[PDB]
Structure 1
């Protein structure tokens, strides 16, 4: 049963205008089977629009490609993104008053490198408010997190969203 195609796509920005379907494919095939690979071009001039997309056979292959950044394709460092509000911070709700830093860290560190964990407390009483913010060193962590249907931390079913 294949993962939805949308979750297997990488948008690739910042291409060299000399990158082609073939050279984009030869590069990104290093990290998995590509079912699709397209450079976007002007319909009249055929001049590159400077971005394209690749579709892998599996989500684990998307992960491998993102873990191999930075990608230099035909001499230029490109910008791959999954299926954009590009942020490095998430809101984590529903953690109640018994969730601590290490609960959040042990779970979220497997999505990416954590730089900040902020467990929110009441300005007047100091009591925990039941939500937190986690800041990562890179946006792909957040992108992986927010497409999951479920997040379970410290036994709690959590609501997780991009934080701006």
Structure 2
């Protein structure tokens, strides 16, 4: 039961034009087994396009690589991002939390995806009653990228709808 390959890929932007399949692989093999590693090049000149992708054997390895950012590859800090499900944001909408979900429920759950900077539990402008949804802002986009590819989110017993926000 191998995780889908799309969820094991990291797109690496900002490459040095000197980076090769081999040097990209040598770098990212520090955090797991790479089943694929390619630097994108022009079909005619073979000059690097400045980006490429690596595929790990497992999702846990993708996490390890993301948690080892910043990555300086061949002298240049690169920009790894998980493959598209790129709309790169740090904020999520959390819906379906009803009136009884509080800040600590959302924090205790989502803090295991990344570092939380803001939790905004939405209330009615007129009555102050909870509206049943919230926004969570993290310090970095990978948290959000991990969150929105999950099929399910269970918080405070509620089955929640979670999507990228703005």
Q: TM-score range by the shorter chain?
A: over 0.9
Q: Supply the distance in 2 between the matched residues of 1:78 and 1:146 (Cα, whole angstroms).
A: 23
1:43-62 to 2 correspondence within 5 Å? 43-62=43-62
Deviation at 1:66, TM superposition (A): 0.1
Give the C-alpha shift of residue 51 in structure 1: 0.0
CA positional deviation for 1:91: 0.0
Render the CA deviation track for 1:96-137: whole Å, top value 9, x for unaligned.
Answer: 000000000000000000000000000000000000000000
Could you tell me which runs of 5 or more consecutive residues in structure 1 were left unpaired when the two chains were aligned: none
> 2:111 matched to which residue of 1?
109
Q: Which runs of 4+ in 1 moved over 6 A?
A: none
1:35-81 CA distance string (max 9 Å, x none): 00000000000000000000000000000000000000000000000
* Matched residue count: 164
- SS of aligned partner of 2:122: strand
User: 1:10-49 CA deviation, whole Å, 9 max, x = no partner?
Assistant: 0000000000000000000000000000000000000000
CA distance, structure 1, for counterparts of residue 23 and residue 80 of structure 2:
15
Report the RMSD for the aligned CA atoms in angstroms: 0.1
Consecutive unaligned residues of structure 2, counting only runs of 5 or more, are: none
Tell me, in whole angstroms, the C-alpha distance in 2 between the residues paired with 1:135 and 1:114. 6
Shift of 1:5: 0.1
Task: Report the alpha carbon displacement of residue 87 of structure 1 after superposing the two structures with TM.
Answer: 0.1
Match of 2:135 among 133, 136, 139: 133
